[PDB]
Design an enzyme around this catalytic site. Structure first.
Site, PDB file in Angstrom:
ATOM      1  N   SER A   1       7.103  -0.014   2.459  1.00  0.00           N
ATOM      2  CA  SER A   1       7.085   0.283   3.884  1.00  0.00           C
ATOM      3  C   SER A   1       7.909  -0.747   4.649  1.00  0.00           C
ATOM      4  CB  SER A   1       5.651   0.302   4.426  1.00  0.00           C
ATOM      5  OG  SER A   1       5.036  -0.977   4.328  1.00  0.00           O
TER       6      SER A   1
ATOM      7  N   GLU B   1       5.081  -3.803  13.774  1.00  0.00           N
ATOM      8  CA  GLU B   1       5.909  -3.158  12.763  1.00  0.00           C
ATOM      9  C   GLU B   1       7.394  -3.169  13.118  1.00  0.00           C
ATOM     10  OE1 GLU B   1       4.379   0.094  10.712  1.00  0.00           O
ATOM     11  OE2 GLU B   1       2.310  -0.632  10.844  1.00  0.00           O
TER      12      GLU B   1
ATOM     13  N   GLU C   1      26.322   6.418  -9.296  1.00  0.00           N
ATOM     14  CA  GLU C   1      26.888   7.630  -8.717  1.00  0.00           C
ATOM     15  C   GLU C   1      26.314   7.913  -7.334  1.00  0.00           C
ATOM     16  OE1 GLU C   1      27.393  12.160 -10.370  1.00  0.00           O
ATOM     17  OE2 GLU C   1      27.805  10.510 -11.763  1.00  0.00           O
TER      18      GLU C   1
ATOM     19  N   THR D   1       3.477  -7.074   3.254  1.00  0.00           N
ATOM     20  CA  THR D   1       3.953  -7.138   1.876  1.00  0.00           C
ATOM     21  C   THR D   1       5.167  -6.239   1.675  1.00  0.00           C
ATOM     22  OG1 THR D   1       1.703  -7.592   1.105  1.00  0.00           O
ATOM     23  CG2 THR D   1       3.300  -6.831  -0.536  1.00  0.00           C
TER      24      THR D   1
ATOM     25  N   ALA E   1      -0.678  -9.877   3.323  1.00  0.00           N
ATOM     26  CA  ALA E   1       0.211 -10.480   4.307  1.00  0.00           C
ATOM     27  C   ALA E   1      -0.231 -10.244   5.747  1.00  0.00           C
ATOM     28  CB  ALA E   1       1.633  -9.947   4.113  1.00  0.00           C
TER      29      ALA E   1
ATOM     30  N   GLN F   1       0.827  -1.203   0.000  1.00  0.00           N
ATOM     31  CA  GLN F   1       0.000   0.000   0.000  1.00  0.00           C
ATOM     32  C   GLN F   1       0.864   1.257   0.000  1.00  0.00           C
ATOM     33  OE1 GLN F   1      -3.800   0.593   2.608  1.00  0.00           O
ATOM     34  NE2 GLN F   1      -2.334   2.129   3.317  1.00  0.00           N
TER      35      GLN F   1
ATOM     36  N   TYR G   1      -2.628  10.172   4.530  1.00  0.00           N
ATOM     37  CA  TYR G   1      -1.602   9.636   3.641  1.00  0.00           C
ATOM     38  C   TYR G   1      -1.441  10.505   2.401  1.00  0.00           C
ATOM     39  CZ  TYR G   1      -1.266   5.264   6.310  1.00  0.00           C
ATOM     40  OH  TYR G   1      -1.053   4.322   7.289  1.00  0.00           O
TER      41      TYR G   1
HETATM   42  N1  LIG Z   1       3.778   7.695   4.126  1.00  0.00           N
HETATM   43  C1  LIG Z   1       2.913   6.714   3.897  1.00  0.00           C
HETATM   44  N2  LIG Z   1       2.924   5.596   4.698  1.00  0.00           N
HETATM   45  C2  LIG Z   1       2.045   4.595   4.474  1.00  0.00           C
HETATM   46  C3  LIG Z   1       1.128   4.674   3.437  1.00  0.00           C
HETATM   47  N3  LIG Z   1       0.390   3.541   3.451  1.00  0.00           N
HETATM   48  C4  LIG Z   1       0.819   2.754   4.466  1.00  0.00           C
HETATM   49  N4  LIG Z   1       1.840   3.402   5.110  1.00  0.00           N
HETATM   50  C5  LIG Z   1       2.612   2.908   6.261  1.00  0.00           C
HETATM   51  O1  LIG Z   1       2.997   1.573   6.002  1.00  0.00           O
HETATM   52  C6  LIG Z   1       2.879   0.781   7.168  1.00  0.00           C
HETATM   53  C7  LIG Z   1       1.934  -0.382   6.897  1.00  0.00           C
HETATM   54  O2  LIG Z   1       2.363  -1.079   5.752  1.00  0.00           O
HETATM   55  P1  LIG Z   1       1.481  -1.157   4.411  1.00  0.00           P
HETATM   56  O3  LIG Z   1       2.271  -0.702   3.208  1.00  0.00           O
HETATM   57  O4  LIG Z   1       0.212  -0.357   4.566  1.00  0.00           O
HETATM   58  O5  LIG Z   1       1.083  -2.714   4.323  1.00  0.00           O
HETATM   59  P2  LIG Z   1       1.363  -3.609   3.021  1.00  0.00           P
HETATM   60  O6  LIG Z   1       2.678  -3.262   2.373  1.00  0.00           O
HETATM   61  O7  LIG Z   1       0.217  -3.475   2.051  1.00  0.00           O
HETATM   62  O8  LIG Z   1       1.425  -5.096   3.625  1.00  0.00           O
HETATM   63  P3  LIG Z   1       0.105  -5.953   3.982  1.00  0.00           P
HETATM   64  O9  LIG Z   1      -1.142  -5.099   3.890  1.00  0.00           O
HETATM   65  O10 LIG Z   1       0.286  -6.505   5.375  1.00  0.00           O
HETATM   66  O11 LIG Z   1      -0.014  -7.091   3.000  1.00  0.00           O
HETATM   67  C8  LIG Z   1       2.354   1.679   8.272  1.00  0.00           C
HETATM   68  O12 LIG Z   1       3.412   2.070   9.115  1.00  0.00           O
HETATM   69  C9  LIG Z   1       1.779   2.866   7.532  1.00  0.00           C
HETATM   70  O13 LIG Z   1       1.864   4.048   8.291  1.00  0.00           O
HETATM   71  C10 LIG Z   1       1.112   5.796   2.621  1.00  0.00           C
HETATM   72  O14 LIG Z   1       0.304   5.887   1.696  1.00  0.00           O
HETATM   73  N5  LIG Z   1       2.009   6.815   2.859  1.00  0.00           N
HETATM   74 MG   LIG Z   2      -1.833  -3.865   2.282  1.00  0.00          MG
END
Ligand SMILES: Nc1nc2c(ncn2[C@@H]2O[C@H](COP(=O)(O)OP(=O)(O)OP(=O)(O)O)[C@@H](O)[C@H]2O)c(=O)[nH]1
Ligand SMILES: [Mg+2]
Ligand SMILES: Nc1ncnc2c1ncn2[C@@H]1O[C@H](COP(=O)(O)OP(=O)(O)CP(=O)(O)O)[C@@H](O)[C@H]1O
Ligand SMILES: Nc1nc2c(ncn2[C@@H]2O[C@H](COP(=O)(O)OP(=O)(O)O)[C@@H](O)[C@H]2O)c(=O)[nH]1
Ligand SMILES: [Ca+2]
Ligand SMILES: [Ca+2]
Ligand SMILES: [Mg+2]
Ligand SMILES: [Mg+2]
EC number: 3.6.5.-
Lengths: 435, 423, 256, 59
Positions: A140, A183, A254, A145, A99, A11, A224
């Site tokens: 993230s 996390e 570089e 994931t 995940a 995400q 977000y």
């Molecule tokens: N800056 C920012 N952080 C994000 C965003 N979306 C999720 N996060 C951060 O990412 C972390 C959660 O991981 P995600 O990327 O949402 O989860 P994922 O990668 O989809 O993994 P799963 O859903 O478990 O399969 C949290 O700490 C969130 O604050 C975003 O759009 N912008």
């Molecule tokens: Mg997700």
């Protein structure tokens, strides 16, 4: 010209990727259609913006990007977003069961089932590159994931593209917006497994982005969308040298040679200035924005470089900036601040100026600024982020809290400890570089 | 992960289950005929979690089970009786006589294959099955004995799906029979092994809230179920509406369950209803954490929170909600374990429940839940020490040894909670 | 209500302020490793500065300035004075990393007794980097109550012996040393734009020779106080350094 | 100012203030080791659940 492939994972990675390509399109004059009236070489060309965009015979400029997520809700917003016709269906890969914020589920259980496909889809973009440089991976640390599948992907990209660089843009977990309690686990796990496969990683703490949005832009509770637009600007500053004509940081190699003398210590601190609310303003000078690069409040990771040591420092200006004003600013700051370099490096700055002032998306919260700067400095103070993270890890793991979720997915309890001791080895490496 | 298969078994399970559907149907804009009639689109964006599509009509993914036809016949003529899928009414005729053994080993075993046949057809047409949601009491026979038997069979066919229960723990304050501690102890052991998330709805608490807070001289089961349906709607808000936190059953389990067997949750709700004056955000957060708002008769100050999930419904300042939630933690941090950092996660949904402008739903994994199992254990031992009323169970083939095992298994569960309260 | 932790039970000064904080009814002490605190009275060595200022919704303060040890330990104090153009220096004995310890040959001697002495001054710097010198210093008294003479008696002595007052002959120099040392490092340690705030009590050691010239000998970052001066000083730490950021004179303000 | 390069889009230079992996089969190996542990744990559960069916028939 040499191409760069972007990979957006999870995400956070996917949503940040959207905000970046939207910004890239506005900066290169590419409409959501995919057309580019300025590009007079139809169907091809080897301009600087071709590093990120390929061309179709119909004049469409499509990104060298692939979006992957183990659930479709987020990438479906790309298939229907304002830039939907920009992307080719095979660039957007989705599963249906995510995940569940579990590194093991992302790396082992579900990652195994899809790792082969995304590599073939990447191989498709690679095959249409005359000389691919490498990959930019957005993800993230805390997501299942983003953490679990990226480490698996980074391992396979090294065995399939051994001679090619990989840069990371990693979102460091902040409880003000975090999704999960585990996390810290996922962050340590993915850092351990990816450390040897990443040449240089740009770490962004949501806490810092969150507070910059509250202070400078005056959003009561940032979302977000707010965070990603600000992050997109910083990313655009780092990658602008690959997409525009210039002589500094022109290829991914570089970045490593300029910012990472020691391979393991490949996490440059990024500082951006100025960030001004669109609902407001006096334009700041070269000296004022350069001085702001040494305020902890403008950094992507809250920490104090005054109590660390610099291995490398790079200043990337965008807008009305001439080299004379940069020197006069550096001379002033070096005598009025604590900038101490390691003994085995020169005390200096690699400066890059792009005359095009920073582009801001219409309807955003960022005031169009006449000159901005992003500083990339490799300072040992960034280890403060590892210290906070390792401590949270130690608290939960002492009682083995939530460990059963990972062991239930085929992971062994040993990987937890072996990953923690790798961070203890990363933490000591920093210690004895800024003694 | 999108679809949830709902199962309501037994008298209590089906009565509570009927209210749950009556409530969330109203929130999603579904009338008793299954047709949507709402003004917003947030009602329909995640309606497939609990509803299948038919003439563009939505039908609950609900399976109604019981060994007596009496309770399920009243559901069929209830306010939302016609909405349920006719074939998903699976019922016997003998009843369970408040006997766990009858529900688990004799009467229920004769009927449970039919239930699984309906579970299979509901699940095999799921695009991505999240798991199962069971509503039942632990003090009777069908919901308790056949309910846990059903959970055991479901886990065998769907071992990689989440199992979630709303359980109604018995209380002498509102008691049907004296054997309720027996049936409750036998059921808890099953829940410890075979569920991921169990919302502990204590009838003792429900009664106390009705008689003390709401000041009802003689609470009925309807008055009790009014609190339950409001809680069930609250704790499932994250499942039924867009959001980033605990938006599905496995992510909820990962955030809430640090150890596989300590998965018994203490739900809370604020304000208490039976109303035009809306509550401030500070008033909502103070009440949702107050003991008098918990649905499990346990003092949270007697234990420590492992994890907490707070859900705020209505149009409010998300800032002010963050301040007040970050405020309660920092003022009573002694009641939050130090070895799980940031164990309090907050969500806000823009749509409030019916009749209320602002509401707050509390889901806590507290070690004080131990007090409840201790309460059931002492009632159990008081009779079992003299083997009283055991013939009802040995007549169905059970052995005394199975009771002693359930007794010590729950004492182990209590010991597990006391272990992490002193950590 | 405000909250705080204690990580140094050996600190006599801060064991007191811990008592008064609990004595106002508005401060609740947590256990050592509870991170949800407003105020840390942290450990002397290896204070986790990198873990502060990361608690959402909590203003965090600590009683130590990160980087102040470059001033406190002698080895770092020597290199700070000679490498800083702000000091380069007339009031610091010659030091390197014909009597040496440079041992000042002819110190001012208290008569009667032919006694040697050294002055200890207590200085408090708050989160805004205001420099507060405690008005009540102490004197730690042959040469070839409790060896503690406070400022009143020493003042009367110099008025009777050498026809001068403590303010003119010594205290003007003392205030100049404190200001020079502390403002030399302000850009390196100040927390005016940090995610956490810092204050710290300092103990300066001064010398006086028979020409009534003041010399800096040592500055201590974790100093103790005289018994009678424990109550007033510690309570002044609450009013100036703690309550100023967490609202519920005995100091001279070395302005700038 | 060292190494000054100018173009139409901008310019870059450098100031100096003071002089001074696992293979594919190994990956697939550990991924298959994690899969067999998942299958083993599930087998022990289904074995445990098969025992309770035996008890149900015995009752
Ligand atoms: N800056 C920012 N952080 C994000 C965003 N979306 C999720 N996060 C951060 O990412 C972390 C959660 O991981 P995600 O990327 O949402 O989860 P994922 O990668 O989809 O993994 P799963 O859903 O478990 O399969 C949290 O700490 C969130 O604050 C975003 O759009 N912008
Ligand atoms: Mg997700
Ligand atoms: N240059 C000097 N000339 C004369 N005496 C000196 C001196 N330097 C230190 N001293 C003597 O040593 C005493 C203080 O010792 P010093 O400050 O160097 O270390 P220390 O840290 O052990 C004392 P404290 O416990 O108060 O910090 C003074 O009373 C003074 O008499
Ligand atoms: N909250 C609530 N509890 C109930 C209701 N009906 C029965 N119970 C409780 O459930 C237990 C009896 O189990 P019951 O559901 O009637 O037996 P079953 O039909 O065989 O499952 C007792 O502890 C009752 O207090 C109800 O409508 N609401
Ligand atoms: Ca072209
Ligand atoms: Ca029969
Ligand atoms: Mg009944
Ligand atoms: Mg059959």
């Amino acid at each position: 010209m040499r191409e760069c492939i972007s990979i957006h994972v999870g995400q956070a990675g996917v949503q940040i990727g959207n905000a970046c390509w939207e910004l890239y399109c506005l900066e290169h004059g590419i409409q959501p259609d995919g057309q580019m009236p300025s590009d007079k070489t139809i169907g091809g060309g080897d301009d600087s913006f071709n590093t990120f965009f390929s061309e179709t015979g119909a004049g469409k400029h499509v990104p060298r990007a692939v979006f992957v997520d183990l659930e479709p809700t987020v990438i479906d917003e790309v298939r229907t977003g304002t830039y939907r016709q920009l992307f080719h269906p095979e660039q957007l890969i989705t599963g249906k069961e995510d995940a569940a914020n579990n590194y093991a589920r992302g790396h082992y259980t579900i990652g195994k089932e899809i790792i082969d496909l995304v590599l073939d889809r990447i191989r498709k973009l690679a095959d249409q590159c005359t000389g691919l440089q490498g990959f930019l991976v957005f993800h993230s640390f805390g997501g299942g994931t983003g953490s679990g599948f990226t480490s698996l992907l980074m391992e396979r990209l090294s065995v399939d593209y051994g001679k090619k660089s990989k840069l990371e843009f990693s979102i460091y977990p902040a409880p003000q917006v975090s999704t999960a309690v585990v996390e810290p686990y996922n962050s340590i796990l993915t850092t351990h497994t990816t450390l040897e496969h990443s040449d240089c990683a740009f770490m962004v703490d949501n806490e810092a982005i969150y507070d910059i949005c509250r202070r400078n832009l005056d959003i009561e509770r940032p979302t977000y969308t707010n965070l990603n637009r600000l992050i997109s600007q910083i990313v655009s500053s780092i990658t602008a040298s690959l997409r525009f004509d210039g002589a500094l940081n022109v290829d991914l190699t570089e970045f490593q040679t300029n910012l990472v003398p020691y391979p393991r210590i490949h996490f440059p601190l990024a500082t951006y200035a100025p960030v001004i609310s669109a609902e407001k303003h006096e334009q700041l000078s070269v000296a004022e924005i350069t001085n702001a690069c040494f305020e902890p409040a403008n950094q992507m990771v809250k920490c104090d470089p005054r109590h660390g040591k610099y291995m490398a420092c790079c200043l990337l200006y965008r807008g009305d900036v001439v080299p004379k004003d940069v020197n006069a600013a550096i001379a002033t700051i070096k005598t009025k601040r604590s900038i101490q370099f390691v003994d085995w490096c020169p005390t200096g700055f690699k400066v890059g100026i792009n005359y095009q002032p920073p582009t801001v998306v219409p309807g955003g919260d960022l005031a169009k600024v006449q000159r901005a700067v992003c500083m990339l400095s490799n300072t040992t103070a960034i280890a403060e982020a590892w210290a906070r993270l390792d401590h949270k890890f130690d608290l939960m793991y002492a009682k083995r809290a939530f460990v059963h979720w990972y062991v239930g997915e085929g992971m062994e309890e040993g990987e937890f400890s072996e990953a923690r001791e790798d961070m203890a080895a990363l933490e000591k490496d920093y210690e004895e570089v800024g003694v | 992960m999108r679809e949830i298969v709902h199962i309501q078994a037994g008298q209590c399970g089906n009565q509570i289950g009927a209210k749950f559907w009556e409530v969330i149907s109203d929130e999603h804009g579904i009338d008793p005929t299954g047709s949507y009639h709402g003004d917003s689109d947030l009602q329909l964006e995640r309606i497939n979690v609990y509803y299948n599509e038919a003439g563009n009509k939505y039908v609950p993914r609900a399976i109604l089970v019981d060994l007596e036809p009496g309770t399920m016949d009243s559901v069929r003529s209830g306010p939302f009786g016609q909405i349920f899928r006719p074939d998903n009414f699976v019922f016997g005729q003998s009843g369970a006589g408040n006997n766990w053994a009858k529900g688990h080993y004799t009467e229920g075993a004769e009927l449970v294959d039919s239930v699984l046949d309906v579970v299979r057809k509901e699940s095999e047409s799921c695009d991505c099955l999240q798991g199962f949601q069971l509503t039942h009491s632990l003090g009777g026979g069908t919901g308790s004995g056949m309910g846990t038997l059903l959970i055991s069979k479901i886990r065998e066919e769907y071992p990689d799906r989440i199992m979630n229960t709303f359980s109604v723990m018995p209380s002498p304050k509102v008691s049907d029979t004296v054997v309720e501690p027996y049936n409750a102890t036998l059921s808890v052991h099953q829940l410890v092994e075979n569920t991921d998330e169990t919302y502990c709805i204590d009838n003792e608490a429900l009664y106390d809230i009705c008689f003390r807070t709401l000041k009802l001289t003689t609470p009925t089961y309807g008055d009790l179920n009014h609190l339950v349906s409001a809680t069930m709607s609250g704790v499932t808000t994250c499942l039924r509406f867009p959001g980033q936190l605990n938006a599905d059953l496995r992510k909820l389990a990962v955030n809430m369950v640090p150890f596989p067997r300590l998965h018994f949750f203490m739900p809370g709700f604020a304000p208490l209803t039976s109303q035009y004056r809306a509550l401030t955000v500070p008033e909502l957060t103070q009440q949702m954490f107050d003991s008098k708002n918990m649905m499990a008769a346990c003092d949270p100050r007697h234990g420590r929170y492992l994890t907490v999930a707070a859900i705020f419904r209505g149009r409010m300042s998300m800032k002010e909600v963050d301040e007040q939630m970050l405020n309660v933690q920092n003022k009573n941090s002694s009641y939050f374990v130090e070895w799980i950092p940031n164990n309090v996660k907050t969500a806000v949904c823009d749509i409030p429940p019916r009749g209320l402008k602002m509401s707050a739903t509390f889901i806590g994994n507290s070690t004080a839940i131990q007090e409840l199992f201790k309460r059931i254990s002492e009632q159990f031992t008081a009779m079992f020490r003299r083997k009283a009323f055991l013939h009802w169970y040995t007549g169905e083939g059970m052995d005394e040894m199975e009771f002693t095992e359930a007794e010590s298994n729950m004492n182990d569960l209590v010991s597990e909670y006391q272990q992490y309260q002193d950590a | 209500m405000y909250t705080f932790v204690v990580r140094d039970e050996n600190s006599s000064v801060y064991a007191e302020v811990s008592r008064l904080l609990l004595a106002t009814g508005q401060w609740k002490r947590l256990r050592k490793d509870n991170p949800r605190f407003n105020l840390m009275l942290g450990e002397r060595n290896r204070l986790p500065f990198g873990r502060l200022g990361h608690e959402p919704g909590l203003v965090q303060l600590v009683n130590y300035y990160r980087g102040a040890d470059k001033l406190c330990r002698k080895a770092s104090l020597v290199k700070l004075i000679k490498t800083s153009p702000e000091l380069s220096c007339t009031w610091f004995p010659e030091s390197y990393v014909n009597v040496w310890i440079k041992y000042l040959e002819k110190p001012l001697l208290l008569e009667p007794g032919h006694r040697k002495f050294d002055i200890r001054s207590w200085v408090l710097v708050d989160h805004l980097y205001n420099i507060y010198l405690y008005r009540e210093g102490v004197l730690r008294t042959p040469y070839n109550e409790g060896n503690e003479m406070f400022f009143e008696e020493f003042n009367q002595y110099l008025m009777d012996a050498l026809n001068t007052t403590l303010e003119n002959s010594i205290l003007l120099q003392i205030k100049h040393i404190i200001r020079s040392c502390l403002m030399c490092i302000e850009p390196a340690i100040s927390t005016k734009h940090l995610h956490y705030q810092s204050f710290q009590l300092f103990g300066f050691d001064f010398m006086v020779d028979e020409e009534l010239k003041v010399w800096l000998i040592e500055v201590n970052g974790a100093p103790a106080c005289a018994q009678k001066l424990y109550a007033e000083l510690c309570q002044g730490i609450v009013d100036v350094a703690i309550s100023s950021v967490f609202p519920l004179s005995i100091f001279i303000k070395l302005h700038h | 100012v060292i190494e000054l390069n100018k173009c139409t889009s901008g310019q870059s230079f450098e100031v100096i203030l003071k002089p001074p992996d696992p293979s594919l089969e190994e990956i697939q190996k550990k991924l298959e080791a994690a899969e067999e542990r998942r299958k083993y744990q599930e087998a022990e559960l289904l074995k445990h659940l098969a025992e309770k069916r035996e008890h149900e028939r015995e009752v």
